[PDB]
Write a protein that binds this DNA or RNA. Structure first.
Lengths: 67, 68, 67, 67, 69, 66
RNA sequence: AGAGAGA
């Protein structure tokens, strides 16, 4: 499953990611964890729990390895 | 389940949390309770029942410790 | 279930509630009934059937006691 | 079930209804049919298949008697 | 059987011109060439578009349709 | 299943498929992967994981056999 | 709460 490999990779490598939300608002930071419904992001020291239903797009700084 | 540990934590510690909503609005308060579809928040003494579908982000006042 | 308690209490007590919609429009009235997907609100005697998917928040006039 | 009861009443009574969509757009007409995902609205004799996921609110001209 | 399927199959069969309005109020016109549970394959001047049903608000035909109700 | 046939032909013929999001924002690229919930688009060498629930429309460059 | 898409 592409979604979970992608999120695990950005997590295990501490890649910076911009997370665009459905409404265009944006967050940047690193992925600390995720489950079926949410992604736990950290931006400059602070946790943000984001619902996946509210996410449009993860644009990572560096590109991920996946199959 | 990170979601429920998070919410159950900020509920147990009475942490303050900014709820950001998809409609652009952001709300600060304390979590009184939640189920699978909704979060009960209190913002200055007033209840608000908020649908999870309408929420984008929670930003706690102080980071929550979780098992991941 | 928190949602069902809340809605049934504001229904039983005829509590006025503000409903904030996903589009930021704001409705005010009293809940006359609900099922899994919808809420029946009366505003100045006029019925509205609202899909819960279009609601963001209910803010009661007085706080509900919940178990 | 409030939803079915409401939609079946306004259908069989031919009640004029404003349908407000998620974006605030308002369509006015009579419901001629519905199923699990859609509602068939007739406006000035034009058929519109509307997805329930796009609907916010039905506001009938006259109140609908329900159980 | 269900109203959505008859409606989409009818306009597809007749190559009816249709406005599709999307959740954000954008509108496309075209003919339906097919659909499945999740998507509608519209053609607006020769040009294929795969539209998710979740992004669609309303199908409005210019020309009224036959439905078993 | 039209969806899966389409995403696949734009993916194998590495088509410039443009992607309109619910908020109207648009991105061009080629599809490298998809699952039930998500699309992996490369745009300008950069990877982007897009949730399907956020996508409005894929508009290809050349049309697809289905 | 009245509908043409680069966050």
């Amino acid at each position: 499953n592409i979604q979970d490999q992608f999120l695990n990779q950005i997590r295990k490598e501490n890649t910076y990611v911009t997370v665009f939300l459905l409404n265009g608002f944006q967050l940047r930071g690193q992925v600390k964890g995720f489950d079926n419904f949410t992604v736990l992001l950290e931006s400059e020291g602070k946790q943000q729990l984001i619902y996946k239903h509210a996410i449009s797009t993860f644009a990572p700084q560096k590109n991920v390895q996946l199959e």
